[PDB]
């Protein structure tokens, strides 16, 4: 009968597939591709979970900071996503893809140049990732009490973004884009352990750092006070992680210490990893909002939506909601002093919510969308491509003209 | 130098660059940026040859910004940090620049229009108490832009680093009800050029790297006569792509970021500014004037400041005005456009006209006593000395 | 229901309701906001344009366009959305059923009347219509046939004397100086303290400041020295972001432009001389009747101290024998609509309409004959 649309959120770490109308994706696979190490030999490849285990194949990660770097592989990564996993005849199903805000236009052009010419799709919509994550939260919210106005923090593996949304419209010229994400946290734990805990095989340092990050890590109120708690009372704060070697099948054990709070700290002290960035995320959010119009500053502080897998850290919003309320209650205090102290202005109600769906938040906002009829109007079309060309998909809301 | 030998000094005290010199000067003595830099330790940089003071200022800071945390005291014509602004004035009056004695000199200053009053009162409070200047005057940036051009009638366009203001004059009669300010200038462009370079992967987050992008702007960026023709060049060719080498040796490449950044003076919505550009604002300022004065404004449009030095700005400005004259005055009569007389004074010395005009008004009024504002007057009256200028303060 | 409808269509506000009623049913600003960003969240009632209070709720992401300026309509496409928002959404009535009574200031271009009457029939299919002067309706609500009205709104300010239902058009005077010219002047002097308001939305904030803290000074030069000495007039205002401001001298310098337009550069004379000079153009016999029956109208006349400053200045010009009595009812912001419900509720008025068939035979130019 009438067929639903295909939805694909190709992220740095993990890739989210499925068809519209559904609540959770049909597949969630790493954004990896295993190749051998002319003719039909370019088809000897595997992607996803079928790529890690392959011994005689080389695993490649074609996506960095949300952008694609090798379109020779991503054109092979997408022809298994369609013909193996989804099993879709692309000439029938429309498509919804996702980009980060700072995706170059030439990457949007080569995307559409691939889908429309190679795969011959009849439609395509390249949406912004974190914007779809806000529509998902509104379903958790009461019906009718939907807050169209909200701020979004979407941090995954590649890059972190702060995107305000006011009355449904995206304030694109105030977006910020922090390059710190779950890959920088992982390589920082992968560093601390190489210095202290030798005995981790080099092939299993990454596997060991994600495991520490996902399980043991957390967020601290103050940094230097945690170092003392780990030193003065070490039995309570130092955990232990037993792994398994893949060659000898013998166990290896380590002690998990300062890397429990030091990884996530780079959200707030990003000069730990990247010296080209110093501002915390608690301050990036204040500049995003204070650069927005004066009327939608209060509703944006009151709905700050954490999305992405690298916001699952324990006590992430509790500190962000606290670093802001310090910053917001002072600014109002200073104005009250310069004016003359005659009016005590109303305080601002900061609120940082962390909604139930994070591993497939962006996909869900793409499935709700694609299941509408409005999607089939804004979708660029095969006809429009033949006439106007691949520059039909050149523009994004982050810029004008 | 006046009759009494007292040197007469002219300091612009701009938002991005200081222009200091003496009266009658046809150039300025020193032109240096208005920044103050304190030392800092960074892991990437290693230097132990040059001594780094605790307070570096001006050219010796911007040159050594790699080892510094620079900070601009002034923003959008307004002074934020006085303790960093006095350290700049000292450098401006010291052995490194204009080694003068303040107690035996006269000074002429400038403030932009429709600024707060406490920013003017607090400057005069500083020149008579801290430096104890003998004679002070606070001029209008527009009127000075005419003295250098040798005029009495002309709508001024003065765009700098923080402020872009428009002030019409007619035979020396101020019309402050027509003064307008656009909130866009060379600093709001320099930010937009970083937000564009960020798409290529170049990150300039630090305070020192803000100057590095200014130099990238002053060198490469320009204005497009017909923005459609420029977009064809960037889509069809790759000749606009230039290269800039940074202090750390890293090379970058800059293309369509050259005409897109300063287009925010004419399409200001690209930086989240609601309103109209410098052309549709200059045409609407004139159309507010008395109908008999409009004919002499089009003939005497005067540019100034260093944000008017984008290659192609006056030609672009002449174009957009004639499109509006055709569309709103003439209602679409191309045949009458030949009679439309417009002349945009774009002299290449328009970078310093607010200073040159201050050299001209000083040399004309150096030897008069009813013009300046004396230390004795400030001791007696206080900030009410400004009533000589007509500025109502108490 | 066969009740007639009434619509003021001022420069700033649209006051609407039914005939026979005592106060209007719908009051909203005459603005049409179009967004300034690209809405990527789909299926979220993201419309191409917003009107009325739905715009002021979303002013942050919009460019508010007043389609009327100094009484004239500049954008007719947007003005259809205003009337369409009035009938279908606010009043919830079809316009073809009832008639409508419109208003207009004097000495406007004839093309403005020609277009309204063309729109009510060809677009809305009204059965008839009528176009009245705004000042004349203010006297119907005042319960008089003798008196000079000074309606001061958002864009226009005009005087109209009448004597026993006989209007003197040779004495009518208009002055393009009103609240929107004062709002803009307030934004220019607020920079002196350090408060910058440029955006259209920020212009609506300053409007709320103007109509909450600005008063008229009985003696301008006297209160000028009061503020210089003390800090009694220093009132404060809380912006929606939580910031706070304080204004002293700027509370009475804004409305003084009505009495000293030289601040705005305008060569014109103040309202205190305009209404006086109008009276001097009337007959010498009827001046005394108008010095007593001096009425005010329009939202701009809601400043405190406006009645006392007019009475003071008028007394200083006119002879000491004539007694100056100002009339300033506490509903003068809606007087022009109140008279409209009165005038349409009369039996004598049922013939002054311009029916559908009369416009069909004479075209839109009939408005010049029917509507004075």
């Amino acid at each position: 009968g009438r067929l639903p649309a295909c939805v694909v959120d190709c992220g740095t770490g993990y890739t989210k597939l499925g068809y519209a109308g559904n609540t959770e994706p049909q597949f969630i696979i790493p954004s990896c591709i295993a190749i051998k190490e002319k003719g039909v030999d370019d088809l000897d490849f595997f992607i996803g979970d079928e790529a890690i285990e392959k011994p005689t194949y080389a695993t490649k990660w074609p996506i960095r900071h949300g952008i694609v770097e090798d379109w020779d592989l991503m054109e092979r990564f997408m022809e298994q996503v369609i013909f193996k996993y989804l099993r879709a005849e692309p000439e029938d199903h429309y498509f919804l893809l996702t980009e980060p805000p700072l995706n170059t236009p030439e990457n949007r052009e080569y995307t559409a140049e691939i889908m429309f010419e190679s795969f011959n799709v009849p439609g395509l919509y390249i949406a912004v990732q974190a914007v779809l994550a806000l529509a998902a939260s509104w379903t958790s919210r009461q019906v009718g009490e939907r807050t169209l106005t909200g701020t979004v923090i979407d941090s995954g593996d590649g890059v972190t973004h702060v995107i305000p949304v006011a009355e449904g419209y995206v304030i694109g010229s105030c977006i910020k884009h922090i390059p710190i994400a779950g890959r920088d946290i992982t390589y920082f734990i992968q560093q601390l352990l190489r210095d202290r805990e030798v005995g981790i095989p080099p092939e299993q340092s990454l596997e060991t750092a994600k495991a520490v990050k996902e399980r043991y890590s957390y967020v601290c109120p103050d940094l230097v006070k945690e170092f003392n708690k780990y030193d003065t009372d070490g039995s309570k704060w130092i955990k232990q992680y037993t792994g398994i070697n893949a060659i000898s099948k013998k166990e290896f054990s380590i002690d998990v210490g300062y890397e429990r709070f030091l990884g996530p700290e780079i959200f707030f002290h990003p000069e730990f990893a990247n010296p080209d960035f110093t501002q915390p995320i608690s301050e990036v959010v204040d500049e995003v909002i204070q650069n927005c119009p004066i009327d939608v500053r209060r509703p944006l502080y009151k709905n700050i939506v954490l999305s992405g897998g690298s916001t699952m850290f324990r006590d992430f919003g509790r500190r962000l909601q606290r670093d802001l309320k310090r910053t917001v209650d002072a600014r109002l205090k200073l104005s009250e002093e310069l004016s003359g102290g005659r009016l005590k202005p109303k305080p601002i109600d900061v609120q940082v919510i962390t909604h139930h769906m994070q591993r497939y938040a962006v996909w869900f906002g793409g499935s709700m969308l694609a299941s509408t009829p409005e999607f089939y109007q804004v979708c660029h079309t095969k006809k429009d491509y033949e006439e106007i060309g691949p520059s039909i998909c050149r523009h994004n809301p982050v810029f004008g003209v | 130098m006046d009759s009494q030998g007292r040197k007469v000094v002219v300091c612009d005290n701009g938002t991005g660059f200081v222009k200091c010199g003496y009266a009658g000067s046809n150039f300025p003595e020193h032109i240096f940026p208005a920044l103050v830099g304190r030392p800092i330790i960074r892991s990437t940089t290693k230097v132990g040859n040059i001594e780094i003071k605790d307070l570096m200022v001006g050219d010796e800071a911007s040159e050594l910004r790699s080892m510094l945390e620079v900070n601009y005291p002034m923003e959008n014509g307004i002074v934020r940090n006085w303790d960093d602004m006095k350290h700049l004035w000292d450098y401006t009056f010291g052995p490194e620049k204009l080694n003068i004695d303040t107690r035996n000199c006269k000074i002429l200053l400038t403030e932009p229009p429709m600024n707060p009053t406490k920013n003017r009162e607090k400057i005069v409070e500083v020149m008579f108490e801290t430096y104890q200047f003998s004679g002070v005057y606070v001029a209008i940036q527009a009127v000075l832009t005419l003295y250098a051009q040798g005029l009495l009638t002309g709508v001024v366009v003065d765009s700098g680093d923080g402020v872009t203001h428009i002030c019409p004059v007619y035979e020396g009669f101020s019309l402050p009800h027509l003064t307008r300010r656009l909130d866009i200038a060379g600093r709001d462009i320099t930010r937009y050029l970083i937000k564009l370079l960020l798409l290529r992967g170049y990150a300039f987050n630090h305070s020192a790297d803000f100057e590095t992008v200014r130099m990238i702007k002053e060198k490469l960026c320009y204005v497009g006569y017909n923005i459609e023709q420029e977009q064809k060049l960037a889509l069809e060719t790759t000749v606009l792509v230039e290269s800039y080498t940074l202090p750390d040796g890293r090379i970058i490449k800059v293309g369509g970021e050259r005409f897109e950044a300063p287009e925010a003076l004419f399409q200001p919505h690209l930086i989240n500014v609601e309103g109209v550009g410098v052309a549709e604002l200059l045409f609407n300022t004139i159309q507010a004037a008395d109908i008999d004065t409009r004919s002499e404004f089009y003939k005497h449009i005067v540019l100034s400041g260093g944000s008017t030095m984008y290659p192609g700005l006056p030609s672009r400005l002449e174009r957009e005005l004639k499109q509006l004259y055709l569309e709103r005055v003439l209602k679409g009569d191309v045949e009458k456009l030949s009679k439309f007389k417009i002349r945009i004074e774009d002299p290449p010395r328009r970078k310093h006209m607010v200073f040159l005009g201050g050299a001209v008004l000083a040399d004309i009024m150096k030897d008069k006593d009813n013009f300046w504002m004396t230390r004795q007057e400030y001791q007696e009256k206080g900030v009410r000395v400004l009533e000589k200028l007509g500025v109502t303060v108490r | 229901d066969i009740a007639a409808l009434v619509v003021d269509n001022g420069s700033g506000m649209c006051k609407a309701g039914f005939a026979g009623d005592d106060a209007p049913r719908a009051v909203f600003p005459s603005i049409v906001g179009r967004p300034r960003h690209q809405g990527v969240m789909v299926g979220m009632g993201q419309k191409d344009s917003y009107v009325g209070d739905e715009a002021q709720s979303k002013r942050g992401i919009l460019t508010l366009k007043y389609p009327i300026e100094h009484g004239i309509v500049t954008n007719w496409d947007d003005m259809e959305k205003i009337w369409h928002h009035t009938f279908y959404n606010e009043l919830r009535v079809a316009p073809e059923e009832h008639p409508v009574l419109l208003t207009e200031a004097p000495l406007n271009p004839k093309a403005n009347r020609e277009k309204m009457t063309q729109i009510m029939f060809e677009t809305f299919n009204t059965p008839a219509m009528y176009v009245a002067i705004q000042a004349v309706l203010s006297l119907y609500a005042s319960g008089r046939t003798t008196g000079i009205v000074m309606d001061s709104g958002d864009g226009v300010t005009h005087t109209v004397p009448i004597y026993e239902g006989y209007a003197l058009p040779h004495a009518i005077l208009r002055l393009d100086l009103a609240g929107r010219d004062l709002t803009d002047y307030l934004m220019k002097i607020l920079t002196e303290r350090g408060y910058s308001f440029t955006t259209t939305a920020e212009r609506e904030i300053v409007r709320d400041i103007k109509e909450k803290l600005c008063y008229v000074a009985l003696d301008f030069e006297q209160e000028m020295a009061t503020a210089a000495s003390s800090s009694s007039l220093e009132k404060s205002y809380e912006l929606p972001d939580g910031q706070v401001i304080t204004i002293g001298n700027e509370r009475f310098r804004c409305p003084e432009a009505l009495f000293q337009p030289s601040f705005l550069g305008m060569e014109s004379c103040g309202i205190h001389e305009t209404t006086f000079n109008s009276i001097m153009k009337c007959d010498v016999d009827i001046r005394k009747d108008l010095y007593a029956n001096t009425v005010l109208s329009g939202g701009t006349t809601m400043y405190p101290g406006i009645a006392d400053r007019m009475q003071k200045e008028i007394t200083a010009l006119a002879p000491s024998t004539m007694k100056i009595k100002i009339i300033a009812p506490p509903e003068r912001k809606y007087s022009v609509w109140i008279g409209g419900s009165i005038l349409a509720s009369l039996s004598t008025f049922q013939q002054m309409w311009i029916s559908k068939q009369e416009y069909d035979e004479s075209g839109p130019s009939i408005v010049h004959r029917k509507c004075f």
Binding site: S335, L338 | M74, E75, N76, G77, I78, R80, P116, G162, D183 | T191, R193, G194, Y195, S196, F197, T198, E202, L239, Q243, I245
Partner: peptide, 7 residues
């Protein structure tokens, strides 16, 4: 500035 804009 004090209100509106930074300066």
């Amino acid at each position: 500035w004090x209100a509106x804009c930074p300066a």
